[PDB]
């Protein structure tokens, strides 16, 4: 329940609108949120329906001048941004500050590639949708509606996962060494007292 | 109705070793190995013995129950693909214009080349799928033999060949020309 300085959410497996409402209320209440991997977000319903939904959104444009009309952003982060902004009083100064409290990204760029990413169980697709229902990955809908940088993201995500795997292999080795060191200091006075204390 | 439990029993012949882990089935037999991912279905597997496998759906509704015997049939087709093979025979059907069919290799790829179909100057090319063998029958005039371990690839390549020879702008009851699947069997006769 703790107040964090920055909350970095891994967007993989999250339902768009539930995550959007939670993040909107979070940034309205003064919490800084960064959402990464917006290309791995999920929308409930099969892919074709959501493509039809985006074309209904695209249908809507100012007749006398298309440049005045809705600006249909095609990037997954900007789709999430539209979902959140629809949930914010964005035309007030307070809503603008709340929106300044938020950052959304595709992939995991620096400096967040070496920080901790969390999940939001109340908005996770695998925990919310019925196991037989069809869903969409926002990266494919985005590519299907004009987003140009899918293959760049997957190349950079495989590169990031290679570096993060070397990271994990190093941490496991030092975790393995410390456990062997913690075993040596077991059954010591500090260890015996901590066992009576619950540690 | 949410049936409490539904079961199907796979049967593994003597020389075949099925191997299932996380809905990825790898069936091994005398003719080779075939693998298939079923991550889009919610099923569980129990090894009854080395020759039998239980396939279970727990608390499944009507459609999710419908997806169980199809898993059984797909794995059985894998087993008979690695123990007997698959063979589709196609007969060349034409009223007037003979169909000139060649097995060509362009760009390092095997193709089935249909020429003179209904007199067209167009040359039809059908890519031959990986794992699929084509042969012009010697024992039969105007016969193509499509064979392979995987039933899905063999039947779909055969369907490609059949579909590319469709008649346009005519009465297809009268103009019956085309390439049609005439026999669906196995490499090992039974």
């Amino acid at each position: 329940s703790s107040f964090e300085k920055v909350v970095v959410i891994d967007g993989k497996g999250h339902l768009l609108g539930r995550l959007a409402s939670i993040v909107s209320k979070q940034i309205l209440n003064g919490q800084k949120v960064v959402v990464v991997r917006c290309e791995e977000l999920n929308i409930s319903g099969e892919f074709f329906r959501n493509k039809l939904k985006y074309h209904d959104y695209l249908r809507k444009a100012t007749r006398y001048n298309k440049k005045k009309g809705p600006f249909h952003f095609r990037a997954p982060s900007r789709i999430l941004y539209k979902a959140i902004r629809g949930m914010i009083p964005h035309k007030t100064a307070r809503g603008k500050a709340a929106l300044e409290r938020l950052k959304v990204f595709e992939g995991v760029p620096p400096p967040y590639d070496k920080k901790k990413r969390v999940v939001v169980p109340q908005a996770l697709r695998v925990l919310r949708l019925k196991p037989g229902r069809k869903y969409t990955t926002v990266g494919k809908l985005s590519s299907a509606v004009g987003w140009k940088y899918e293959s760049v993201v997957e190349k950079l995500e495989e590169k990031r996962k290679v570096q993060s795997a070397e990271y994990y292999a190093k941490k496991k080795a030092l975790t393995k060494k410390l456990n062997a060191a913690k075993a040596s200091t077991a059954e010591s006075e500090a260890a015996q007292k901590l066992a009576a204390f619950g540690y | 109705m949410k049936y409490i439990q539904t079961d199907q029993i796979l049967d593994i012949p003597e020389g075949v070793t099925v191997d299932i882990k996380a809905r990825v089935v790898k069936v091994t037999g005398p003719r080779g190995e075939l693998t298939k991912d079923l991550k889009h279905i919610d099923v569980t597997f129990n090894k009854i013995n080395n020759r039998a496998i239980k396939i279970t759906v727990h608390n499944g509704d009507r459609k999710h129950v419908a997806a169980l015997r199809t898993v059984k049939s797909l794995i059985a087709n894998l087993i008979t693909g690695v123990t007997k093979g698959y063979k589709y025979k196609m007969r060349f059907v034409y009223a007037h214009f003979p169909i000139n069919v060649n097995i060509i290799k362009k760009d390092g790829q095997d193709y089935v080349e249909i020429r003179n179909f209904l007199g067209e100057k167009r040359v039809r090319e059908v890519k031959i799928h990986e794992g699929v063998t084509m042969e012009i029958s010697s024992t039969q005039k105007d016969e193509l033999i499509v064979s392979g371990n995987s039933l899905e690839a063999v039947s779909q390549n055969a369907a490609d060949i059949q579909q590319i020879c469709r008649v346009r702008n005519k009465d297809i009851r009268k103009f019956l020309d085309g390439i049609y699947v005439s026999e669906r069997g196995t490499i090992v006769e039974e």
């Binding site: 329940s1 703790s2 107040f3 309205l28 209440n29 003064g30 307070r94 500050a97 709340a98 | -």
Partner: protein, 106 residues
């Protein structure tokens, strides 16, 4: 000691309000780590400080405080209602306040 905090962290969320009308005399406060009215009932009556900075010095200090107290719980997730000696200004929505541990009843 690297830590010197003697107050519980809080956040100013809102005024008491309906859809269209707000009530500045009562502020709604979220206490950190509190998730139920049973948890939040520990903090009833504790005084509250909002600490902020101003341009002019008063007695050599640019730090000012507005004091309040917890009056009741609010809702089901451990928020409380507060009453400050001066209503919290609306720009402070989302700013952190200090929930004092006194008047203590431990």
């Amino acid at each position: 000691a690297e830590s010197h905090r003697l107050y519980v962290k809080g956040k100013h969320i809102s005024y008491q309000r309906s859809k269209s009308v707000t009530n500045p005399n009562v502020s709604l406060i979220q206490i950190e780590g509190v998730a139920s009215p049973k948890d939040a009932k520990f903090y009833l009556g504790k005084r509250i400080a909002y600490v902020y900075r101003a341009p002019k010095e008063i007695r050599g200090s640019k730090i000012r405080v507005i004091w309040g107290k917890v009056t009741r719980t609010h809702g089901n997730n451990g928020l409380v209602r507060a009453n400050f000696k001066k209503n919290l200004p609306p720009k402070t929505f989302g700013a952190s306040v200090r929930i004092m541990l006194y008047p203590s009843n431990i």
